[PDB]
Enzyme design. Structure first.
Site, PDB file in Angstrom:
ATOM      1  N   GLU A  11       1.023  -1.376   0.272  1.00 38.56           N
ATOM      2  CA  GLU A  11       0.227  -0.246  -0.163  1.00 38.56           C
ATOM      3  C   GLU A  11       0.629   1.167   0.154  1.00 38.56           C
ATOM      4  O   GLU A  11       0.538   1.727  -0.605  1.00 38.56           O
ATOM      5  CB  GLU A  11      -1.280   0.137   1.340  1.00 38.56           C
ATOM      6  CG  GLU A  11      -1.880  -1.106   1.351  1.00 38.56           C
ATOM      7  CD  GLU A  11      -2.756  -0.705   0.440  1.00 38.56           C
ATOM      8  OE1 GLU A  11      -2.806   0.253  -0.433  1.00 38.56           O
ATOM      9  OE2 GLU A  11      -3.638  -2.117   0.228  1.00 38.56           O
ATOM     10  N   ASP A  20      -6.731   6.937  -5.455  1.00 39.56           N
ATOM     11  CA  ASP A  20      -5.830   4.816  -5.510  1.00 39.56           C
ATOM     12  C   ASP A  20      -5.855   4.324  -6.780  1.00 39.56           C
ATOM     13  O   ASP A  20      -5.978   5.489  -7.719  1.00 39.56           O
ATOM     14  CB  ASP A  20      -6.630   4.417  -4.160  1.00 39.56           C
ATOM     15  CG  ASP A  20      -8.264   3.492  -4.578  1.00 39.56           C
ATOM     16  OD1 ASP A  20      -8.821   4.426  -5.497  1.00 39.56           O
ATOM     17  OD2 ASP A  20      -8.908   3.132  -4.398  1.00 39.56           O
ATOM     18  N   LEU A  32      -9.166   4.379   2.871  1.00 35.52           N
ATOM     19  CA  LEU A  32      -9.834   4.695   2.015  1.00 35.52           C
ATOM     20  C   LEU A  32     -11.228   5.604   2.143  1.00 35.52           C
ATOM     21  O   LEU A  32     -11.318   5.348   3.674  1.00 35.52           O
ATOM     22  CB  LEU A  32     -11.120   3.330   1.103  1.00 35.52           C
ATOM     23  CG  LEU A  32     -12.260   4.348  -0.306  1.00 35.52           C
ATOM     24  CD1 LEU A  32     -11.871   4.861  -1.416  1.00 35.52           C
ATOM     25  CD2 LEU A  32     -13.232   2.630  -0.563  1.00 35.52           C
ATOM     26  N   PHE A 104      -8.720  -6.640   3.520  1.00 28.77           N
ATOM     27  CA  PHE A 104      -7.915  -5.251   3.334  1.00 28.77           C
ATOM     28  C   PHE A 104      -8.068  -4.275   2.041  1.00 28.77           C
ATOM     29  O   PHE A 104      -8.908  -2.965   2.157  1.00 28.77           O
ATOM     30  CB  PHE A 104      -6.648  -4.935   4.071  1.00 28.77           C
ATOM     31  CG  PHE A 104      -6.342  -3.940   4.042  1.00 28.77           C
ATOM     32  CD1 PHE A 104      -5.780  -3.168   3.034  1.00 28.77           C
ATOM     33  CD2 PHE A 104      -5.958  -2.802   5.322  1.00 28.77           C
ATOM     34  CE1 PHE A 104      -5.380  -1.485   3.496  1.00 28.77           C
ATOM     35  CE2 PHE A 104      -5.725  -2.003   6.017  1.00 28.77           C
ATOM     36  CZ  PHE A 104      -5.275  -1.029   4.842  1.00 28.77           C
ATOM     37  N   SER A 117     -12.221 -20.234  -5.665  1.00 27.43           N
ATOM     38  CA  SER A 117     -10.805 -20.309  -4.983  1.00 27.43           C
ATOM     39  C   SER A 117     -10.946 -20.183  -3.145  1.00 27.43           C
ATOM     40  O   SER A 117     -10.323 -21.326  -2.830  1.00 27.43           O
ATOM     41  CB  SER A 117     -10.199 -18.884  -4.704  1.00 27.43           C
ATOM     42  OG  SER A 117     -10.739 -18.348  -6.315  1.00 27.43           O
ATOM     43  N   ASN A 132      -6.762 -20.432 -10.042  1.00 21.39           N
ATOM     44  CA  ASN A 132      -8.474 -20.200  -9.814  1.00 21.39           C
ATOM     45  C   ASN A 132      -8.232 -18.548  -9.634  1.00 21.39           C
ATOM     46  O   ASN A 132      -8.916 -17.279 -10.282  1.00 21.39           O
ATOM     47  CB  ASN A 132      -8.660 -20.689  -9.439  1.00 21.39           C
ATOM     48  CG  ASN A 132     -10.075 -20.755  -9.558  1.00 21.39           C
ATOM     49  OD1 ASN A 132     -11.175 -19.462  -8.691  1.00 21.39           O
ATOM     50  ND2 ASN A 132     -11.263 -20.587  -9.915  1.00 21.39           N
TER      51      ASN A 132
END
Ligand SMILES: [Cl-]
Length: 162
Positions: A11, A20, A32, A104, A117, A132
Protein backbone atom coordinates in the site's frame (compact mmCIF):
# COMPACT_ATOMS: atom_id res chain seq x y z
CA UNK A 1 7.59 -10.41 8.20
CA UNK A 2 4.02 -9.99 9.49
CA UNK A 3 0.65 -8.64 8.21
CA UNK A 4 1.58 -5.06 9.05
CA UNK A 5 4.90 -5.09 7.21
CA UNK A 6 3.27 -6.94 4.30
CA UNK A 7 0.46 -4.39 3.91
CA UNK A 8 2.93 -1.50 4.36
CA UNK A 9 4.87 -2.82 1.34
CA UNK A 10 1.76 -3.27 -0.84
CA UNK A 11 0.00 0.00 0.00
CA UNK A 12 2.84 2.42 0.77
CA UNK A 13 2.43 5.51 2.94
CA UNK A 14 1.12 8.98 1.91
CA UNK A 15 0.42 11.79 4.30
CA UNK A 16 -1.62 13.83 1.87
CA UNK A 17 -5.01 12.97 0.23
CA UNK A 18 -4.37 10.97 -2.98
CA UNK A 19 -6.25 8.87 -5.44
CA UNK A 20 -5.98 5.08 -5.44
CA UNK A 21 -5.63 2.78 -8.45
CA UNK A 22 -9.46 2.94 -8.92
CA UNK A 23 -9.40 6.68 -8.72
CA UNK A 24 -10.84 6.96 -5.15
CA UNK A 25 -9.80 9.41 -2.45
CA UNK A 26 -7.39 7.70 0.03
CA UNK A 27 -4.91 8.68 2.71
CA UNK A 28 -2.12 6.98 4.81
CA UNK A 29 -1.61 3.27 4.38
CA UNK A 30 -4.40 2.43 1.98
CA UNK A 31 -7.19 4.02 4.11
CA UNK A 32 -10.15 4.54 1.64
CA UNK A 33 -11.91 7.78 2.43
CA UNK A 34 -14.84 7.94 -0.02
CA UNK A 35 -15.84 6.66 -3.49
CA UNK A 36 -17.37 10.06 -4.14
CA UNK A 37 -15.71 12.34 -6.76
CA UNK A 38 -15.74 15.25 -4.40
CA UNK A 39 -12.53 16.34 -2.86
CA UNK A 40 -14.68 18.11 -0.29
CA UNK A 41 -16.59 15.08 0.69
CA UNK A 42 -13.08 13.47 1.10
CA UNK A 43 -11.76 16.19 3.40
CA UNK A 44 -14.89 15.99 5.44
CA UNK A 45 -14.52 12.18 5.96
CA UNK A 46 -10.92 12.69 6.85
CA UNK A 47 -11.65 15.22 9.56
CA UNK A 48 -14.35 12.88 10.87
CA UNK A 49 -11.84 9.98 10.95
CA UNK A 50 -9.12 11.95 12.72
CA UNK A 51 -11.19 14.11 15.03
CA UNK A 52 -9.58 17.38 14.03
CA UNK A 53 -9.50 19.94 11.24
CA UNK A 54 -6.90 18.53 8.96
CA UNK A 55 -7.13 20.36 5.69
CA UNK A 56 -6.15 17.04 3.94
CA UNK A 57 -2.90 16.44 5.72
CA UNK A 58 -2.08 14.02 8.54
CA UNK A 59 1.02 13.05 10.48
CA UNK A 60 2.82 9.63 10.52
CA UNK A 61 1.27 8.61 13.90
CA UNK A 62 -2.19 9.49 12.67
CA UNK A 63 -1.59 7.33 9.58
CA UNK A 64 -0.44 4.51 11.80
CA UNK A 65 -3.46 4.73 14.00
CA UNK A 66 -5.88 4.42 11.05
CA UNK A 67 -3.78 1.51 9.88
CA UNK A 68 -4.12 -0.31 13.28
CA UNK A 69 -7.90 0.16 13.16
CA UNK A 70 -8.14 -1.06 9.55
CA UNK A 71 -6.17 -4.23 10.21
CA UNK A 72 -8.23 -4.95 13.34
CA UNK A 73 -11.48 -4.36 11.40
CA UNK A 74 -10.31 -6.67 8.58
CA UNK A 75 -9.55 -9.71 10.84
CA UNK A 76 -12.84 -9.17 12.68
CA UNK A 77 -14.86 -8.84 9.55
CA UNK A 78 -13.33 -12.21 8.46
CA UNK A 79 -14.27 -13.86 11.81
CA UNK A 80 -17.90 -12.66 11.60
CA UNK A 81 -18.32 -13.79 8.02
CA UNK A 82 -19.91 -17.20 7.27
CA UNK A 83 -17.98 -17.54 3.98
CA UNK A 84 -14.68 -16.44 5.15
CA UNK A 85 -14.29 -17.82 8.58
CA UNK A 86 -14.07 -21.48 7.62
CA UNK A 87 -11.32 -20.79 5.12
CA UNK A 88 -9.36 -18.65 7.58
CA UNK A 89 -9.61 -21.31 10.36
CA UNK A 90 -8.28 -23.92 7.96
CA UNK A 91 -5.08 -22.10 6.96
CA UNK A 92 -1.65 -21.83 8.44
CA UNK A 93 -0.36 -18.44 9.79
CA UNK A 94 1.32 -17.18 6.68
CA UNK A 95 -1.58 -17.95 4.39
CA UNK A 96 -3.92 -16.29 6.91
CA UNK A 97 -1.94 -13.04 6.32
CA UNK A 98 -2.62 -13.46 2.52
CA UNK A 99 -6.34 -13.67 3.07
CA UNK A 100 -6.31 -10.63 5.42
CA UNK A 101 -4.47 -8.77 2.66
CA UNK A 102 -7.18 -9.46 0.08
CA UNK A 103 -9.94 -8.40 2.51
CA UNK A 104 -8.11 -5.16 3.40
CA UNK A 105 -7.91 -4.32 -0.36
CA UNK A 106 -11.29 -5.38 -1.62
CA UNK A 107 -13.54 -5.74 1.37
CA UNK A 108 -15.31 -8.70 2.75
CA UNK A 109 -17.93 -8.78 0.08
CA UNK A 110 -15.47 -8.79 -2.77
CA UNK A 111 -13.44 -11.61 -1.18
CA UNK A 112 -16.56 -13.65 -0.27
CA UNK A 113 -17.22 -13.60 -4.07
CA UNK A 114 -14.12 -15.81 -4.79
CA UNK A 115 -16.18 -18.94 -3.96
CA UNK A 116 -14.30 -21.52 -6.02
CA UNK A 117 -10.84 -20.25 -4.86
CA UNK A 118 -11.84 -20.38 -1.14
CA UNK A 119 -13.09 -23.92 -1.63
CA UNK A 120 -9.73 -24.75 -3.22
CA UNK A 121 -7.74 -23.11 -0.36
CA UNK A 122 -9.74 -25.10 2.26
CA UNK A 123 -8.83 -28.28 0.43
CA UNK A 124 -5.17 -27.25 0.36
CA UNK A 125 -4.94 -27.58 -3.47
CA UNK A 126 -2.34 -24.74 -3.65
CA UNK A 127 -1.45 -24.84 -7.34
CA UNK A 128 -5.07 -25.09 -8.38
CA UNK A 129 -6.09 -22.21 -6.13
CA UNK A 130 -3.30 -20.01 -7.54
CA UNK A 131 -4.49 -20.60 -11.14
CA UNK A 132 -8.15 -19.83 -10.22
CA UNK A 133 -7.28 -16.68 -8.22
CA UNK A 134 -5.52 -15.20 -11.36
CA UNK A 135 -8.73 -15.35 -13.45
CA UNK A 136 -10.11 -12.20 -11.90
CA UNK A 137 -10.45 -8.51 -12.46
CA UNK A 138 -8.26 -8.12 -9.32
CA UNK A 139 -5.31 -9.88 -11.00
CA UNK A 140 -5.73 -7.97 -14.31
CA UNK A 141 -5.94 -4.56 -12.68
CA UNK A 142 -3.14 -4.86 -9.97
CA UNK A 143 -1.07 -7.74 -11.32
CA UNK A 144 2.22 -7.13 -9.35
CA UNK A 145 0.50 -6.99 -5.97
CA UNK A 146 -1.86 -9.90 -6.95
CA UNK A 147 1.20 -12.12 -7.90
CA UNK A 148 2.78 -11.45 -4.53
CA UNK A 149 -0.44 -12.48 -2.67
CA UNK A 150 -0.97 -15.49 -4.92
CA UNK A 151 2.63 -16.63 -4.41
CA UNK A 152 2.09 -16.43 -0.68
CA UNK A 153 -0.96 -18.72 -0.97
CA UNK A 154 0.92 -21.11 -3.24
CA UNK A 155 4.04 -21.46 -1.10
CA UNK A 156 3.04 -20.67 2.43
CA UNK A 157 6.27 -18.58 2.77
CA UNK A 158 7.09 -14.81 2.65
CA UNK A 159 9.36 -15.25 -0.36
CA UNK A 160 7.54 -12.75 -2.64
CA UNK A 161 8.08 -10.07 -0.09
CA UNK A 162 11.77 -10.71 0.51
CL1 LIG B 1 -12.56 5.42 10.30
Amino acid sequence: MNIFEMLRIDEGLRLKIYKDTEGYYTIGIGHLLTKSPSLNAAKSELDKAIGRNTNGVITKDEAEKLFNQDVDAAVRGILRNAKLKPTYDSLDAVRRAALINMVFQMGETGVAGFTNSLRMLQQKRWDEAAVNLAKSRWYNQTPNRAKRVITTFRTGTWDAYK
